[PDB]
C-alpha cells in the first residue's frame, strides 16, 4: 500500500516510472519502447553506424545503442547524432556507460562486440573483441589511421 516502487533506483531502466496501486508503470522516452517483461525501455530499431557527423560507415543494420554506446558518432537514416557522454540522453541510451548496450529482450547490459557489429572500427585489419572494448592490429607494413579507423 505504502509502497511506491518508483522510489527504488532500479525500477524502469532507461524509463520513467509511475507508481500504480500494486505495481508501477514504465513510460519509455521517445524512440524507446518497453521490453517484453516490462522492466525497462529499449530501442530496437536498426540502422547504420557512422564515424562522422552521416558518413564513414562502420556498421550496418545495427542498434543505436550498440552504435552510440560505442565509438560510433551518428546513426540511422535519417542521420541521428549520438548523444554526448555527459547527457541524460546518453544516461538512458547507455545505462552501463561506454562499451555496453542493454539486451533488447532482457534489458541486461552486455558487452558490445565491435568486431562483429562495428567492423568499420578496423578496416583492413584484425579486430579482437575484449571486455568493454576491443583491439585492432594492422597487418605488417600498414598502420592505423586513428581518425579513419582504416589500416593506413
Curated annotation (Swiss-Prot):
It is found in: Secreted. Disulfide bonds join 6-17, 12-26, 28-41, 49-67, 54-79, 68-82, 69-94, 115-127, 122-136, 138-151. Changing residue 138 to S: Found in a patient with Marfan-like syndrome; likely pathogenic. Glycans are attached at residues 23, 86, 133. Cleavage of N- and C-terminus by furin is required for incorporation into the extracellular matrix and assembly into microfibrils. The C-terminus, which corresponds to the Asprosin chain, was initially thought to constitute a propeptide. Fibrillin-1 and Asprosin chains are still linked together during the secretion from cells, but are subsequently separated by furin, an essential step for incorporation of Fibrillin-1 into the nascent microfibrils. Residues 2-42, 111-152 form the EGF-like domain. Residues 47-94 form the TB domain. It is linked to Marfan syndrome: A hereditary disorder of connective tissue that affects the skeletal, ocular, and cardiovascular systems. A wide variety of skeletal abnormalities occurs with Marfan syndrome, including scoliosis, chest wall deformity, tall stature, abnormal joint mobility. Ectopia lentis occurs in most of the patients and is almost always bilateral. The leading cause of premature death is progressive dilation of the aortic root and ascending aorta, causing aortic incompetence and dissection. Ectopia lentis 1, isolated, autosomal dominant: An ocular abnormality characterized by partial or complete displacement of the lens from its space resulting from defective zonule formation. Belongs to the fibrillin family. This is Fibrillin-1. It comes from Homo sapiens (Human). The gene is FBN1. The chain holds residues 1486 to 1647 of 2871 of the full protein.
Amino acid at each position: 500500500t505504502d509502497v511506491n516502487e518508483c522510489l527504488d533506483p532500479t525500477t524502469c531502466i532507461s524509463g520513467n516510472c509511475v507508481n500504480t496501486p500494486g505495481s508501477y508503470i514504465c513510460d519509455c522516452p521517445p524512440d524507446f519502447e518497453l521490453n517484453p517483461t516490462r522492466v525497462g525501455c529499449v530501442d530496437t530499431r536498426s540502422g547504420n553506424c557512422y564515424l562522422d557527423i552521416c558518413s564513414n560507415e562502420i556498421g550496418v543494420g545495427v542498434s543505436k545503442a550498440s552504435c552510440c554506446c560505442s565509438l560510433g558518432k551518428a546513426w540511422g537514416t535519417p542521420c541521428e547524432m549520438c548523444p554526448a557522454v555527459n547527457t541524460s540522453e546518453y544516461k538512458i541510451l547507455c545505462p552501463g556507460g561506454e562499451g555496453f548496450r542493454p539486451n533488447p529482450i532482457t534489458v541486461i547490459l552486455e558487452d558490445i562486440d565491435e568486431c562483429q557489429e562495428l567492423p568499420g572500427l578496423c578496416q583492413g585489419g584484425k579486430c579482437i573483441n575484449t571486455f568493454g572494448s576491443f583491439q585492432c592490429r594492422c597487418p605488417t607494413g600498414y598502420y592505423l589511421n586513428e581518425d579513419t579507423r582504416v589500416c593506413d
